[PDB]
Design a protein around this ligand. Structure first.
Ligand SMILES: CO/N=C(\C(=O)NCB(O)O)c1csc(N)n1
Ligand SMILES: [K+]
Ligand SMILES: [K+]
Length: 263
């Protein structure tokens, strides 16, 4: 609805920085509304959904098992690893790592999972092979969050991300069982409360993944809709603001409130 664009472009103003937005019909793939849809933004932790999509594609092909245990050391821990720092002794399964990476945004979990698929180059190859010729992962945690101005490393566009997410959640890319597992991890997101979830009406479904990075970067990807089932995808990114995290969060929550109001 154009009223939501009032709020998006208000955000870009308030934040002193670019905001990218797209609202996509889940069933049809129709772009309902957009802003800067084909400009690049750092993915930050939103890539972790793509990562676990690639992992689940390998499970479906018999190249990985969700119950396989990976053992790691203090040597693997990177900043912001609230789950993996607790399991150094006995390790974690692939399933557990994807849960951690998505619900808790655990960074070591993401690095361990990247290692399983052959690293950033292979995630990018996986994306290109599914028709996403835009999104690229180049680095590991933590450096992939550096958000250097005009750098295309570790970036997506709102449009590329939204259509990739649609394909993962609804397409023949993944078996039904694997698509639902991915959804389930995203529904279980624990570290996105101040964002779209704070605008979500009772009874609505949301499956999301947030991101934060350097230089004011912030974003979210989500599938959401009324009566317990998703019907649209929303992608919001920003980078470059000097605003506080609370300020960034509130702008995203307010974009959410508007898109809900005008659904
Ligand atoms: C909780 O972390 N803050 C992060 C981070 O590593 N986020 C991972 B994901 O985008 O949710 C961070 C990285 S650079 C920065 N400033 N904050
Ligand atoms: K429109
Ligand atoms: K160990």
């Amino acid at each position: 609805h154009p009223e939501t664009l009032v709020k998006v472009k208000d955000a870009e103003d308030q934040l002193g920085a670019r905001v990218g937005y797209i609202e996509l019909d889940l069933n049809s793939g129709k772009i309902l509304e957009s802003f800067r849809p084909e400009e690049r933004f750092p993915m930050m932790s939103t890539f972790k959904v793509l990562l676990c999509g690639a992992v689940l594609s390998r499970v479906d092909a018999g190249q990985e098992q969700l119950g396989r245990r990976i053992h790691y050391s203090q040597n693997d821990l990177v900043e912001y690893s609230p789950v993996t720092e607790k399991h150094l002794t006995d390790g974690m399964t692939v399933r557990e790592l994807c849960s951690a990476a998505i619900t808790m945004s655990d960074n070591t979990a993401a690095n361990l999972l990247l290692t399983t698929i052959g690293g950033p180059k292979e995630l990018t190859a996986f994306l290109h092979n599914m028709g996403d010729h835009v999104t690229r992962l180049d680095r590991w945690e933590p450096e992939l969050n550096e958000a250097i101005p005009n750098d295309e490393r570790d970036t997506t566009t709102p449009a590329a991300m939204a259509t990739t997410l649609r394909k993962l959640l609804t397409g023949e890319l993944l078996t039904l069982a694997s698509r639902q597992q991915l959804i389930d991890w995203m529904e279980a997101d624990k570290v996105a409360g101040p964002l779209l979830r704070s605008a979500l009406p009772a009874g609505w479904f949301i499956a999301d993944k947030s991101g934060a990075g350097e230089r004011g970067s912030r974003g979210i990807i989500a599938a959401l809709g009324p009566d317990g089932k998703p019907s649209r995808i929303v992608v919001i990114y920003t980078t470059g603001s000097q605003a506080t995290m609370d300020e960034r969060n509130r702008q995203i929550a307010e974009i959410g409130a508007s898109l809900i109001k005008h659904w």
